[PDB]
Amino acid sequence: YALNTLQTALTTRDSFDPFASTRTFNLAMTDIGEMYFMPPLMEALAQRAPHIQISTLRPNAGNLSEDMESGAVDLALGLLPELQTGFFQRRLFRHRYVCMFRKDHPSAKSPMSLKQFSELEHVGVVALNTGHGEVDGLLERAGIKRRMRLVVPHFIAIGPILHSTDLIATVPERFAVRCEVPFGLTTSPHPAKLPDIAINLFWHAKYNRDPGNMWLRQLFVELFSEA
Amino acid sequence: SFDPFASTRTFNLAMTDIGEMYFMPPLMEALAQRAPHIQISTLRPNAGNLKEDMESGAVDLALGLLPELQTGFFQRRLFRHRYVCMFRKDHPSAKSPMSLKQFSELEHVGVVALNTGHGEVDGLLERAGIKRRMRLVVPHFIAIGPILHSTDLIATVPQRFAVRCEVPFGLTTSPHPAKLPDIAINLFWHAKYNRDPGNMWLRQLFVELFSEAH
Amino acid sequence: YALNTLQTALTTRDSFDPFASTRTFNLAMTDIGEMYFMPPLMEALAQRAPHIQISTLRPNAGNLSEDMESGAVDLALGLLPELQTGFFQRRLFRHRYVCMFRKDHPSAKSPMSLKQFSELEHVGVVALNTGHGEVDGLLERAGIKRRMRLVVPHFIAIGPILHSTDLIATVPERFAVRCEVPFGLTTSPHPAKLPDIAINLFWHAKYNRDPGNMWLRQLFVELFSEA
Amino acid sequence: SFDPFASTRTFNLAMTDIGEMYFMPPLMEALAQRAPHIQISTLRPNAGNLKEDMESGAVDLALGLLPELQTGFFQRRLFRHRYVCMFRKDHPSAKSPMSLKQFSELEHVGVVALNTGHGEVDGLLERAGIKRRMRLVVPHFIAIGPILHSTDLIATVPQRFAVRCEVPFGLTTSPHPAKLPDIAINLFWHAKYNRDPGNMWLRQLFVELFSEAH
């Protein structure tokens, strides 16, 4: 603790010029994260730091905690409960779950009732080891019966699937927003009581005062923080 | 015997994220009318052990390149797709067909796509001396559509991914200026299930909707 | 399947006279279940079947599935997702979660805000391997910070604790109802979005047509079913 | 050293359900003013391995009868409580002090309370020839208060449980007509933590609020 903090503060830190910097920042995030964060982020970086490189990865890949300590991963986004001691953290926003289907669905309504929700057919996404993976069990434990026509491991094909079928889906609202116009889809408030999931920004304490890290962090907070 | 309109069976299909985006929408549309009570579920080829799960009937069919699947597996060509180059339709400079000169001047989103046919792309472009300004690297394909919509980035991408993205994200494609090989996409099943009537029927459905032989 | 169903229907079944029956029914249920079900149940049985014996047990005790097959446990109540094939089932109601504290609390309000909820101190109950055990993680995953003054494994002492302190608790609403008057406590709607939990009545298929089982079942449905 | 008013420490106390209901309300009331920033957490003696968890500091103190805790543990008597007999105050016939004759005529809720001092009760009443009409048997004590409130059942119950239930559930007690032994309730700690200042302080708090020596 002590000999580490005093060492991380006595070393000369690498200055950061956003206009000139050529450095690569590595960020951890889920697929929903990638699709939500990267478009506005890359748009902003085009005007603010034109020569940096961004590279993303999923939290499960590599060893996240240790990669963050060594500087190999600069930031992490999501829920990530395993990041505690050694890690600073800051809530960006709360995902609220919502209900999605195609705009010309023959029966689906907004606001959808719990009764209709349970009559209709569904595409589910497993989303293993993320907070969205908890959704199927939350619904099962509320005794909300679901005709599960299709289950997929991840979110990539949800938009296209809902476009061509009468299936409905339970998705984070920021996913639905990135999907409504492109695939011709509406949402409804979720008729089940689903809990929100907090999305946080995490950095290791070694880089709490690194100027480049501080600069990217504050960007994330600037673009994505609702607080 | 196997009756599509009454069957209540669960089929378990292994495919990549491109596979899922490409096969599933038209497949589910077909099933709405042909097998209203079956259940489909997908998984990635790297999830679990694919060979063993297919021998045991946990996984009914696999879609993709999949050179590992040799002995004990039948396979049937479904299509080849080329790599294509993608960008937003109102890109300030990008043109179709795009030149190698422009390709190398412009900024890119790469996707790593590890343990997949699409993961060879970066290596093949390096070895051909094709330099690339890699602004953004991502592991998978989910975010490419929206990223391209909101930036002046360009992506190298399988043609059938581009088919699912062009209209939705307001994008255009160009034939790829680099000499990239085509990717064969095959339907796979274990020998044990070669004559299983339910397998046969779904196999035949995939051929019908996705085979470009004829 | 087939040789079992035809065997369980060709055997003469034991008649049931509620007024005369002297038989012991064994029911599985959680502590919250015991406190909610047993008082009204025993009250009803005093007038309907005065000579039967009831005995309860927790689902984790013994081997529940196998004990139900053999007739050693007659019924089970709760969520119990492990009971599927071989088991009939019927939803009694849905637990909605609620917020509890003493009626003369200096600061607590109804309806409590999410902000106050997170300012105040809490008693938590772990409730391992039940749906109520999921609550702490649901709140953690919504980024709802909680000053956890006290944690207890089970619900027994919640009423008394809330009576003598300024702690608040997150409890099923039927628990709160069995507690409000006795311990001088109010509730508030929960400011967090918590999912309901379904409470079901389960019986094995061997006893689907046993008259005694059928009789107790229909009693549970009669007293406790909100549908 | 150890400073109550600033300490931010977590103490982990093993006790039964009666223990929890009895000790925790007055303990938490005392701490509100004496140690506003500590954290308490409880568990049952059967949960985990108690001996090993106390040696390692996972569990700071244990409250109860606990004859297993011999070598490596100090202990201090806190109180003895008698068994008592409980029923609703407007019971149609039940009287205090209750006779053995009435006790055996009336209907009962028993609690098994396995692996606990209170679990000996059923056996002791059988061996004394005291017959009992056991209408309801439950494993634990949670539901007894409400059950007694809504029925004409009677329960044999530790006196300190009855102390927590009498007024809330509108109940009365009688000294028990059977010859049941008292239950000693002791405070326990591992030898290793005999001079740990934080342990010492909480130990002393328990003695202050719960010791009936003086």
Side-chain angles (χ1 to χ4, degrees), chain B residues 7 9 19 29-31 59-60 80 104 146 153 163 169 189 192 206-207:
Chain B
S7 180
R9 209 239 255 210
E29 188 179 64
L31 298 171
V59 179
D60 307 68
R80 319 228 280 160
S104 299
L153 264 7
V163 128
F169 298 102
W189 65 101
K192 280 204 211 174
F206 263 83
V207 166

PDB file of all heavy atoms in Angstrom, chain B residues 7 9 19 29-31 59-60 80 104 146 153 163 169 189 192 206-207:
ATOM      1  N   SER B   7     -43.629 -30.661 -34.552  1.00  0.00           N
ATOM      2  CA  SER B   7     -42.441 -30.909 -33.729  1.00  0.00           C
ATOM      3  C   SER B   7     -42.206 -29.804 -32.725  1.00  0.00           C
ATOM      4  O   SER B   7     -42.470 -28.627 -32.972  1.00  0.00           O
ATOM      5  CB  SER B   7     -41.176 -31.077 -34.556  1.00  0.00           C
ATOM      6  OG  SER B   7     -40.073 -31.311 -33.702  1.00  0.00           O
ATOM      7  N   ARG B   9     -39.297 -29.768 -30.913  1.00  0.00           N
ATOM      8  CA  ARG B   9     -37.910 -30.086 -30.676  1.00  0.00           C
ATOM      9  C   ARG B   9     -37.068 -28.819 -30.610  1.00  0.00           C
ATOM     10  O   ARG B   9     -37.456 -27.769 -31.135  1.00  0.00           O
ATOM     11  CB  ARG B   9     -37.411 -30.964 -31.831  1.00  0.00           C
ATOM     12  CG  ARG B   9     -36.307 -31.897 -31.460  1.00  0.00           C
ATOM     13  CD  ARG B   9     -35.043 -31.727 -32.245  1.00  0.00           C
ATOM     14  NE  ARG B   9     -34.901 -32.803 -33.215  1.00  0.00           N
ATOM     15  CZ  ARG B   9     -33.741 -33.284 -33.641  1.00  0.00           C
ATOM     16  NH1 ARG B   9     -32.590 -32.795 -33.191  1.00  0.00           N
ATOM     17  NH2 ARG B   9     -33.733 -34.261 -34.527  1.00  0.00           N
ATOM     18  N   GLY B  19     -22.379 -15.257 -38.938  1.00  0.00           N
ATOM     19  CA  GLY B  19     -23.328 -16.323 -39.212  1.00  0.00           C
ATOM     20  C   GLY B  19     -24.683 -16.043 -38.596  1.00  0.00           C
ATOM     21  O   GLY B  19     -25.700 -16.156 -39.239  1.00  0.00           O
ATOM     22  N   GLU B  29     -37.918 -16.545 -40.038  1.00  0.00           N
ATOM     23  CA  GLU B  29     -39.044 -16.148 -40.876  1.00  0.00           C
ATOM     24  C   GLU B  29     -39.660 -17.368 -41.557  1.00  0.00           C
ATOM     25  O   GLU B  29     -40.872 -17.505 -41.603  1.00  0.00           O
ATOM     26  CB  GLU B  29     -38.552 -15.153 -41.917  1.00  0.00           C
ATOM     27  CG  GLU B  29     -39.608 -14.471 -42.765  1.00  0.00           C
ATOM     28  CD  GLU B  29     -38.964 -13.483 -43.731  1.00  0.00           C
ATOM     29  OE1 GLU B  29     -38.193 -13.953 -44.614  1.00  0.00           O
ATOM     30  OE2 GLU B  29     -39.190 -12.248 -43.583  1.00  0.00           O
ATOM     31  N   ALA B  30     -38.803 -18.257 -42.050  1.00  0.00           N
ATOM     32  CA  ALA B  30     -39.209 -19.491 -42.713  1.00  0.00           C
ATOM     33  C   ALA B  30     -39.898 -20.427 -41.725  1.00  0.00           C
ATOM     34  O   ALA B  30     -40.944 -21.001 -42.044  1.00  0.00           O
ATOM     35  CB  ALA B  30     -37.992 -20.183 -43.333  1.00  0.00           C
ATOM     36  N   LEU B  31     -39.318 -20.569 -40.531  1.00  0.00           N
ATOM     37  CA  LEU B  31     -39.872 -21.445 -39.493  1.00  0.00           C
ATOM     38  C   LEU B  31     -41.230 -20.971 -38.959  1.00  0.00           C
ATOM     39  O   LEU B  31     -42.025 -21.787 -38.512  1.00  0.00           O
ATOM     40  CB  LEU B  31     -38.899 -21.600 -38.323  1.00  0.00           C
ATOM     41  CG  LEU B  31     -37.560 -22.233 -38.679  1.00  0.00           C
ATOM     42  CD1 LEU B  31     -36.594 -22.133 -37.518  1.00  0.00           C
ATOM     43  CD2 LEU B  31     -37.751 -23.679 -39.091  1.00  0.00           C
ATOM     44  N   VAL B  59     -25.210 -30.372 -29.982  1.00  0.00           N
ATOM     45  CA  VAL B  59     -25.158 -29.432 -31.092  1.00  0.00           C
ATOM     46  C   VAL B  59     -25.476 -30.196 -32.371  1.00  0.00           C
ATOM     47  O   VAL B  59     -24.771 -31.146 -32.738  1.00  0.00           O
ATOM     48  CB  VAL B  59     -23.755 -28.755 -31.219  1.00  0.00           C
ATOM     49  CG1 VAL B  59     -23.728 -27.798 -32.386  1.00  0.00           C
ATOM     50  CG2 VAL B  59     -23.386 -28.026 -29.933  1.00  0.00           C
ATOM     51  N   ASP B  60     -26.524 -29.746 -33.048  1.00  0.00           N
ATOM     52  CA  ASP B  60     -27.071 -30.432 -34.204  1.00  0.00           C
ATOM     53  C   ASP B  60     -26.323 -30.130 -35.499  1.00  0.00           C
ATOM     54  O   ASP B  60     -26.032 -31.050 -36.272  1.00  0.00           O
ATOM     55  CB  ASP B  60     -28.550 -30.091 -34.333  1.00  0.00           C
ATOM     56  CG  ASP B  60     -29.307 -30.348 -33.039  1.00  0.00           C
ATOM     57  OD1 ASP B  60     -29.112 -29.671 -32.022  1.00  0.00           O
ATOM     58  OD2 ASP B  60     -30.124 -31.285 -32.955  1.00  0.00           O
ATOM     59  N   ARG B  80     -19.604 -19.089 -50.871  1.00  0.00           N
ATOM     60  CA  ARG B  80     -18.369 -18.359 -50.590  1.00  0.00           C
ATOM     61  C   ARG B  80     -18.729 -16.891 -50.533  1.00  0.00           C
ATOM     62  O   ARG B  80     -19.534 -16.423 -51.345  1.00  0.00           O
ATOM     63  CB  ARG B  80     -17.357 -18.545 -51.702  1.00  0.00           C
ATOM     64  CG  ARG B  80     -17.273 -19.948 -52.252  1.00  0.00           C
ATOM     65  CD  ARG B  80     -15.858 -20.467 -52.373  1.00  0.00           C
ATOM     66  NE  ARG B  80     -15.167 -19.970 -53.557  1.00  0.00           N
ATOM     67  CZ  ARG B  80     -13.842 -19.962 -53.705  1.00  0.00           C
ATOM     68  NH1 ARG B  80     -13.044 -20.409 -52.735  1.00  0.00           N
ATOM     69  NH2 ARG B  80     -13.307 -19.494 -54.828  1.00  0.00           N
ATOM     70  N   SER B 104      -5.125   2.754 -48.286  1.00  0.00           N
ATOM     71  CA  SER B 104      -4.005   2.941 -47.368  1.00  0.00           C
ATOM     72  C   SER B 104      -3.875   4.362 -46.841  1.00  0.00           C
ATOM     73  O   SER B 104      -3.198   4.572 -45.864  1.00  0.00           O
ATOM     74  CB  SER B 104      -2.712   2.477 -48.027  1.00  0.00           C
ATOM     75  OG  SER B 104      -2.815   1.094 -48.331  1.00  0.00           O
ATOM     76  N   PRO B 146     -22.724   0.851 -36.658  1.00  0.00           N
ATOM     77  CA  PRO B 146     -22.819   2.165 -36.014  1.00  0.00           C
ATOM     78  C   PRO B 146     -21.533   2.956 -36.022  1.00  0.00           C
ATOM     79  O   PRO B 146     -21.602   4.166 -36.164  1.00  0.00           O
ATOM     80  CB  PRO B 146     -23.205   1.821 -34.579  1.00  0.00           C
ATOM     81  CG  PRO B 146     -23.851   0.533 -34.688  1.00  0.00           C
ATOM     82  CD  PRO B 146     -23.125  -0.226 -35.740  1.00  0.00           C
ATOM     83  N   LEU B 153     -14.330   6.432 -40.840  1.00  0.00           N
ATOM     84  CA  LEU B 153     -13.541   5.210 -40.824  1.00  0.00           C
ATOM     85  C   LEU B 153     -14.057   4.313 -41.924  1.00  0.00           C
ATOM     86  O   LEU B 153     -15.202   4.433 -42.367  1.00  0.00           O
ATOM     87  CB  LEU B 153     -13.696   4.480 -39.491  1.00  0.00           C
ATOM     88  CG  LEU B 153     -12.714   4.634 -38.325  1.00  0.00           C
ATOM     89  CD1 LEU B 153     -11.672   5.683 -38.544  1.00  0.00           C
ATOM     90  CD2 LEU B 153     -13.485   4.882 -37.027  1.00  0.00           C
ATOM     91  N   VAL B 163     -24.213  -6.967 -46.348  1.00  0.00           N
ATOM     92  CA  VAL B 163     -25.581  -7.130 -46.827  1.00  0.00           C
ATOM     93  C   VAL B 163     -26.580  -6.821 -45.709  1.00  0.00           C
ATOM     94  O   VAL B 163     -27.574  -6.151 -45.941  1.00  0.00           O
ATOM     95  CB  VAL B 163     -25.785  -8.569 -47.424  1.00  0.00           C
ATOM     96  CG1 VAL B 163     -27.015  -9.303 -46.835  1.00  0.00           C
ATOM     97  CG2 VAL B 163     -25.871  -8.492 -48.935  1.00  0.00           C
ATOM     98  N   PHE B 169     -27.668   0.951 -41.684  1.00  0.00           N
ATOM     99  CA  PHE B 169     -26.757   1.993 -41.178  1.00  0.00           C
ATOM    100  C   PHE B 169     -26.376   3.101 -42.189  1.00  0.00           C
ATOM    101  O   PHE B 169     -25.657   4.029 -41.832  1.00  0.00           O
ATOM    102  CB  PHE B 169     -25.532   1.362 -40.515  1.00  0.00           C
ATOM    103  CG  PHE B 169     -25.886   0.512 -39.328  1.00  0.00           C
ATOM    104  CD1 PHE B 169     -25.910  -0.875 -39.431  1.00  0.00           C
ATOM    105  CD2 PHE B 169     -26.265   1.104 -38.132  1.00  0.00           C
ATOM    106  CE1 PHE B 169     -26.277  -1.653 -38.357  1.00  0.00           C
ATOM    107  CE2 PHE B 169     -26.633   0.330 -37.040  1.00  0.00           C
ATOM    108  CZ  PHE B 169     -26.641  -1.054 -37.146  1.00  0.00           C
ATOM    109  N   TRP B 189     -22.516 -31.454 -40.029  1.00  0.00           N
ATOM    110  CA  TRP B 189     -23.225 -32.330 -39.091  1.00  0.00           C
ATOM    111  C   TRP B 189     -22.403 -33.592 -38.805  1.00  0.00           C
ATOM    112  O   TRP B 189     -21.564 -33.993 -39.626  1.00  0.00           O
ATOM    113  CB  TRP B 189     -24.625 -32.648 -39.597  1.00  0.00           C
ATOM    114  CG  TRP B 189     -24.694 -33.442 -40.853  1.00  0.00           C
ATOM    115  CD1 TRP B 189     -24.935 -34.774 -40.952  1.00  0.00           C
ATOM    116  CD2 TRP B 189     -24.559 -32.961 -42.195  1.00  0.00           C
ATOM    117  NE1 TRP B 189     -24.945 -35.165 -42.268  1.00  0.00           N
ATOM    118  CE2 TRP B 189     -24.718 -34.072 -43.057  1.00  0.00           C
ATOM    119  CE3 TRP B 189     -24.307 -31.707 -42.763  1.00  0.00           C
ATOM    120  CZ2 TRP B 189     -24.627 -33.969 -44.448  1.00  0.00           C
ATOM    121  CZ3 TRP B 189     -24.233 -31.605 -44.142  1.00  0.00           C
ATOM    122  CH2 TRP B 189     -24.390 -32.733 -44.970  1.00  0.00           C
ATOM    123  N   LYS B 192     -23.238 -39.557 -37.090  1.00  0.00           N
ATOM    124  CA  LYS B 192     -24.318 -40.195 -36.324  1.00  0.00           C
ATOM    125  C   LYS B 192     -25.680 -39.679 -36.703  1.00  0.00           C
ATOM    126  O   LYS B 192     -26.651 -40.420 -36.631  1.00  0.00           O
ATOM    127  CB  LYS B 192     -24.197 -39.902 -34.825  1.00  0.00           C
ATOM    128  CG  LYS B 192     -23.203 -40.737 -34.011  1.00  0.00           C
ATOM    129  CD  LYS B 192     -23.619 -40.741 -32.509  1.00  0.00           C
ATOM    130  CE  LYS B 192     -22.409 -40.841 -31.573  1.00  0.00           C
ATOM    131  NZ  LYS B 192     -22.815 -40.697 -30.127  1.00  0.00           N
ATOM    132  N   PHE B 206     -31.697 -25.197 -44.649  1.00  0.00           N
ATOM    133  CA  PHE B 206     -30.542 -24.321 -44.742  1.00  0.00           C
ATOM    134  C   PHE B 206     -30.076 -24.252 -46.194  1.00  0.00           C
ATOM    135  O   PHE B 206     -29.756 -23.176 -46.682  1.00  0.00           O
ATOM    136  CB  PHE B 206     -29.387 -24.815 -43.845  1.00  0.00           C
ATOM    137  CG  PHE B 206     -29.320 -24.132 -42.514  1.00  0.00           C
ATOM    138  CD1 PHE B 206     -30.110 -24.556 -41.465  1.00  0.00           C
ATOM    139  CD2 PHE B 206     -28.462 -23.066 -42.311  1.00  0.00           C
ATOM    140  CE1 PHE B 206     -30.070 -23.918 -40.243  1.00  0.00           C
ATOM    141  CE2 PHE B 206     -28.398 -22.424 -41.079  1.00  0.00           C
ATOM    142  CZ  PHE B 206     -29.204 -22.840 -40.046  1.00  0.00           C
ATOM    143  N   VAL B 207     -30.035 -25.407 -46.859  1.00  0.00           N
ATOM    144  CA  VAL B 207     -29.678 -25.508 -48.269  1.00  0.00           C
ATOM    145  C   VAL B 207     -30.659 -24.712 -49.109  1.00  0.00           C
ATOM    146  O   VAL B 207     -30.277 -23.931 -49.968  1.00  0.00           O
ATOM    147  CB  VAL B 207     -29.705 -26.971 -48.746  1.00  0.00           C
ATOM    148  CG1 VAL B 207     -29.680 -27.061 -50.266  1.00  0.00           C
ATOM    149  CG2 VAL B 207     -28.528 -27.741 -48.153  1.00  0.00           C
TER     150      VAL B 207
END
